[PDB]
Symmetry: C2
Subunit: 225 residues, 2 copies
């Protein structure tokens, strides 16, 4: 009887009347160190990322990817790379029904203590191919699903040319996140971008690490079905 | 006293009243093997490519680039790569004043006699990095302006990785053209894409050739100021 987040999410993004009915009104909107409220009359249908061909899920470490169904909290996030902003949607499962409880629209939490920020790095990595080439770890690991036996992988290293040929279309302006409980700390020296499609079985994962003060692409895994 | 096309073009794209006054109404619109007319009342301001950071000029051969001011005809073109369509604007200098005389919106003239079409090739080259890598000529020539003495060039060859790092952002959905008299033949086995910016001095040129039935990137020249 409890709603599955994935099934609710699709319905919330695609049906306007359902969306309006599943949001707390007046909606708490935390922005610029103050708190606003969005009135029901002011709400604009939010298709979230239902008009995208793919979306991303972020992890501080690769081990954080191995995971309840008794989970009642989900944060959906939109990372505005160029604006340096983040929009967060607080979804909560109440009496088995998912509801939108609040929204944050704030400045991208920046890594302090004088250390290269992952999202500032990623923005340049995706938008500056010269910079992108300079930040590939040597060697650059490539993992793909073995087209034979079950759960098997093929592992090789990539030359710069091969990385640019086989890479997924890297998001240049926005990233997303689905936080279902994994650590989301501005101080991690590792970061993982998992890219997933909508009913096409596409799955590409990118593994980054801050090495001697600079973020580098460590590994590219293509687990696309 | 005769209008310069570049100065007219900027004004036509940026001023709505000027644009309306410089178009023949009813405007002959040649589309789908018939002829329509756009009424003055129906005209929507066309910013052309004034909201783009760059535009392209196309040549059948490199030698066609060396060139009147007594030129009174200019065709501006929009190549819709995915739709397989081309929109042409016929600009004519009458009594020293540029006017829009007619528009074509037709099917992309396709190369017949069973030969790889340049625009079908270019669309895949720009949208499929794997295909793009397979269509780089070996060796791939790179020419750049020498940062020393006047009119001098530096010539080297590029590795696949270097081509992807230094390439301009390749247009993926549309190309443009400014035809001021150069040959525009669907049967040429050579093609040149000259990419130019708006008041930033950016200039990148790409040289292609159909070699043993397949178009290949032969040379990349970066003459950016
Ligand atoms: Cl995304
Ligand atoms: Cl590498
Ligand atoms: Cl280190
Ligand atoms: Cl263009
Ligand atoms: Cl090459
Ligand atoms: Cl390479
Ligand atoms: Cl040949």
């Amino acid at each position: 009887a409890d709603e599955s987040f994935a099934d609710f999410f699709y319905n919330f993004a695609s049906d306007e009347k359902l969306q309006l009915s599943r949001i707390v009104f007046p909606l708490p909107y935390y922005t610029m160190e103050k708190k606003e409220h969005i009135e029901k009359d002011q709400w604009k249908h939010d298709p979230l990322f239902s008009r995208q061909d793919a979306y991303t899920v972020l992890f501080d470490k690769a081990e954080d990817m191995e995971m309840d169904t008794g989970l009642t909290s989900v944060k959906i996030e939109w990372i505005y790379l160029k604006k340096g902003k983040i929009k967060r949607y607080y979804f909560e499962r109440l009496k088995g029904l998912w509801k939108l409880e609040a929204i944050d629209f704030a400045d991208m939490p920046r890594e302090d203590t004088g250390k290269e920020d992952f999202f500032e790095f990623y923005e340049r990595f995706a938008n500056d191919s010269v910079f992108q080439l300079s930040r590939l770890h040597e060697p650059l690991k490539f993992v793909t699903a073995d087209p034979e036996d079950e759960f098997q992988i093929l592992e090789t290293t990539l030359e710069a040319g091969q990385w640019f040929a086989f890479q997924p279309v890297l998001p240049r302006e926005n990233l997303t996140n689905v936080n279902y409980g994994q650590n989301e700390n501005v101080h991690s020296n590792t970061k993982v971008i998992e890219m997933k499609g909508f009913g096409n079985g596409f799955n590409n994962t990118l593994y980054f690490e801050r090495r001697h003060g600079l973020w580098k692409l460590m590994q590219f895994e293509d687990l696309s079905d």
